[PDB]
């Protein structure tokens, strides 16, 4: 009931070596370079419902100061999807979950798309492997 | 190395039924389902913590905060110690706080808005 995907994202981040946890308030927290960051979690049933249809083939890319990528992707990298700016709602990281059947042909094995500020990309990469 | 008292406060809060932790304002506490930074200060004497005249007054409300032992204006050192956070935890040796009712040595400085959510978590 919504917490399901927040817990899934927390376990996926903890598997990749991140210190992550859940805060009901409906938010997720992550440690990047020794700093706590709020992660907004959105789940949509289809790429159209998440305004990601034209996005999927472009990942990873940088747009309006954000790096947008599939959760497991480490490959080298415009307006941004209007629904996404509203979804950030104060937080700086956004995690969008789609069914894996939609993301997987494009390389998104887990179904998650991470919208992260460009300032945080260096720290995010140095918290894996 | 300063982390000893943050861990002590986290265990004391978890004992009283709070969801508290130290991040790898290093302490976080969950009040009514909301995450709050807790600033931790440890001082060797009541004078070093600007608490000499405070100890006999606890518990009280001053400048919009409820000041009490863990279990009128506020000291100027304390406003600077909050430094952006909204909750402040001051630790003194128990020998100083105990004759006044502070068995643990901790003084909590909590906003009046959070007093209702703090009470209903014990």
Residue numbers in the entry:
A (entry chain B): 5 to 29, 39 to 90, 98, 100 to 150
B (entry chain A): 5 to 28, 39 to 85, 98, 100 to 149
Passage from the reporting paper:
The enzyme, termed Hjc_15-6, is encoded in the genome of phage Tth15-6, which infects Thermus thermophilus. Amino-acid sequence and structure comparison suggested that the enzyme belongs to a group of enzymes classified as archaeal Holliday junction-resolving enzymes, which are typically divalent metal ion-binding dimers that are able to cleave X-shaped dsDNA–Holliday junctions (Hjs). Holliday junction-resolving enzymes are nucleases that cleave four-way DNA–Holliday junctions (Hjs) into two unconnected DNA duplexes. Activity screening demonstrated that purified recombinant Hjc_15-6 acts as a resolvase, cleaving Holliday-junction oligomers.
The crystal structure of Hjc_15-6 was determined to 2.5 Å resolution using the selenomethionine single-wavelength anomalous dispersion method. The putative active-site residues in the proposed motif E10-SD39–40-EVK53–55, except for residue 39, agree with archaeal Hj-resolving enzymes, as predicted by others. Moreover, this signature is situated within the most conservative part of Hjc_15-6, where the putative active-site residue Glu10 (motif I) is located in α-helix 1, Asp40 (motif II) in β-sheet 2 and Glu53 and Lys55 (motif III) in β-sheet 3. However, Ser39 prior to Asp40 (motif II) is not shown to be part of β-sheet 2. This may be due to the gap between residues 30 and 37, which are not seen in any chain in the two models. The electron-density map of Hjc_15-6 suggested that each monomer has two bound sulfate or phosphate groups with full occupancy. In addition, there are two further sulfate- or phosphate-binding sites in both monomers that have an occupancy of 0.5 and/or have high B values. Based on the observations above, we may conclude that Hjc_15-6 has a typical archaeal endonuclease fold and a dimer organization that resembles those of other archaeal Hj-resolving enzymes.
